Amino acid sequence: SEWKARRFWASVGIHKEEGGWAVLLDERPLRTPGKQPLRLPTEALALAIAEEWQAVQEVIDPNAMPLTRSANSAIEKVAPQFDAVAAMLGDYGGTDLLSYRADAPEALVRAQAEGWDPLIDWAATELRAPLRITHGVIPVPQDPVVLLKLRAEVASLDPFGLTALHDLVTLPGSLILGLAVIRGRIDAPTAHALSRIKEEFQAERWGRDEEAEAQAASRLAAMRDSERFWHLTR
């Protein structure tokens, strides 16, 4: 309803810049909520963000503009705090979902093994990061050298790329799943399905939980948004 939310522009285009691309609402350059200049690493993302602004009807709906939202985060929070963010994501290497297997029932333990072992194998091979796997509640600490190797893989990403990595790691609760998505080993819908092997297994055996399903659907959409953002920024 806010007057400030009303669309007043006719066309939306893009244009180069001394440092990245820009999106234009008529002749007026798009700025970040923080008044800072919005510069995008690629034309692909610029054009995609322009479609979001061309799609505005009467009033701006931020929920409908996931790319703009992530671009703002990259410029405003991730680029300036790259080191602290790469560290926080890297930390998941020591509490990775794939390293914790159920104790029971057996059919669940086998399900996890079949879906996850291949990803643990990939991480040991491609990232030279074999994780220690635990069964049950008592956490096994990871090899300090492996944690250094995984944190280093994260640190080597560009800022926009680190921003996309964020949700791919935190939502499923796994750094391996997040890196597998951006490295092209699996896509986001597969990463999502692998993370919920236990949830899916229990639902099929003991009954669906509507709230859990709603929350899972939300995580999947956010993971697909992060994946899109990663590809657009390459």
End-to-end CA distance of the chain: give it in Å, rounded: 36
The whole-angstrom separation of Cα 15 and Cα 21 is 6
The whole-angstrom separation of Cα 152 and Cα 121 is 19
The whole-angstrom separation of Cα 165 and Cα 149 is 17
Burial class (CB in 10 A: 0-12, 13-18, 19+), 76: middle
Cβ(50)–Cβ(29) under 8 Å? no
Question: Which phi and psi angles does 24 have, rounded to 5°?
Answer: -120, 125
Please enumerate in sequence order all residues whose Cβ is within 8 A of that of 35, keeping only pairs 6 or more positions apart, or say none. none
Helices first, then strands: H and E counts in the chain: 10, 5
Beta-bridge partners for 31: 37
Burial class (CB in 10 A: 0-12, 13-18, 19+), 214: exposed
**Regarding beta strands 134-135 and 28-29, do their DSSP bridges make them parallel or antiparallel, or are they unpaired?**
unpaired
Cβ(162)–Cβ(86) under 8 Å? yes
Burial class (CB in 10 A: 0-12, 13-18, 19+), 42: middle
Count of other CB atoms within 10 angstroms of residue 24: 17
DSSP summary character for residue 140: P
Q: Which residues of 158-194 are buried (b: 16+ CB within 10 A; e: fewer)?
A: ebbbbbbbbbbbbbbbbbbbbbbbbeebbebeebbeb
Method: X-ray
Which long-range contacts (C-beta less than 8 Å, at least 24 apart) are formed by 201-206? 201/107, 201/108, 201/111, 202/108
DSSP summary character for residue 74: I
Domains of the chain: 1-64 (3.30.2180.10), 65-234 (1.10.3580.10)
Structural tokens at position 101: 């297997």
Alpha-carbon separation of residue 210 from 47, 200, 226 (angstroms): 37, 12, 25
The whole-angstrom separation of Cα 67 and Cα 146 is 33
Which residue from 82, 51, 85 is spatially nearest to 68, judged by alpha carbons? 51
**Cα Rg for the chain, rounded, in angstroms?**
20
Please enumerate in sequence order all residues whose Cβ is within 8 A of that of 170, keeping only pairs 6 or more positions apart, or say none. 89, 92
Cβ(45)–Cβ(232) under 8 Å? yes
